[PDB]
Amino acid sequence: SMIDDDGYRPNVGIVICNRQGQVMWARRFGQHSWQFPQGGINPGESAEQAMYRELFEEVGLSRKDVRILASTRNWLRYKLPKRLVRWDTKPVCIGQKQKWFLLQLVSGDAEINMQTSSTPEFDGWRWVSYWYPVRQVVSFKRDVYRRVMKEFASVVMSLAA
Ligand SMILES: Nc1ccn([C@@H]2O[C@H](COP(=O)(O)OP(=O)(O)OP(=O)(O)O)[C@@H](O)[C@H]2O)c(=O)n1
Numbered sequence: 112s113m114i115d116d117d118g119y120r121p122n123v124g125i126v127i128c129n130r131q132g133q134v135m136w137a138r139r140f141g142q143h144s145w146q147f148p149q150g151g152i153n154p155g156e157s158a159e160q161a162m163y164r165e166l167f168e169e170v171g172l173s174r175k176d177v178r179i180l181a182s183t184r185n186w187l188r189y190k191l192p193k194r195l196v197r198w199d200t201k202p203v204c205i206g207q208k209q210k211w212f213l214l215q216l217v218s219g220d221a222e223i224n225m226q227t228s229s230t231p232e233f234d235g236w237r238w239v240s241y242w243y244p245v246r247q248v249v250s251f252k253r254d255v256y257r258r259v260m261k262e263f264a265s266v267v268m269s270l271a272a
């Protein structure tokens with residue numbers, strides 16, 4: 112996605128839950144750091160379209176495999192640690208502004224395929240407890256994750272009853 116006037120790239124994030132209130136947790140490709148799926152919003156994409164493209168390209172799933180249960184309204188932003196800022200572009204990107212989606216997986220676990228890209232976002236995934244991501248994502252994304260998971264909590268725990 113294109114860097115905006117303030118240095119932020121527009122992006123979407125995806126929290127995928129099951130009926131037991133667990134959420135899909137994925138290992139960043141070639142790292143031991145885990146996160147939710149996130150991807151850029153291209154010009155002429157809506158947030159929801161960009162979400163479904165991320166879902167297909169990095170999780171292998173269709174609209175028909177999920178249902179949308181909630182979404183955040185306005186951007187939430189994180190800034191990159193200055194060490195990880197890439198200076199090989201103009202304008203330089205300092206972080207992301209993100210819109211988030213809560214999806215329920217309704218197809219079988221085996222429909223998820225994280226290996227279809229030549230450069231996958233992830234090595235693979237596992238189910239984790241709902242709040243585990245807030246404490247386990249890389250530090251500079253924790254403020255965003257805490258806000259997202261708090262906003263989505265009302266909907267997920269009702270399913271887990
Ligand atoms: N746990 C993490 C998260 C991020 N990064 C680094 O910080 C950059 C920015 O991370 P992020 O904002 O999550 O975006 P990307 O992973 O680069 O993904 P995208 O191409 O969709 O922007 C990454 O390229 C990576 O070098 C990292 O090293 N370890």
Ligand SMILES: Nc1ccn([C@@H]2O[C@H](COP(=O)(O)OP(=O)(O)OP(=O)(O)O)[C@@H](O)[C@H]2O)c(=O)n1
Pocket residue numbers: 187188189190254
């Ligand atoms: N509670 C928060 C956290 C973040 N933000 C927005 O999201 C960006 C990322 O937040 P943060 O990393 O915490 O900013 P800092 O680099 O710590 O400090 P400064 O932003 O003042 O240069 C902020 O610029 C802000 O616009 C916000 O409005 N309210």
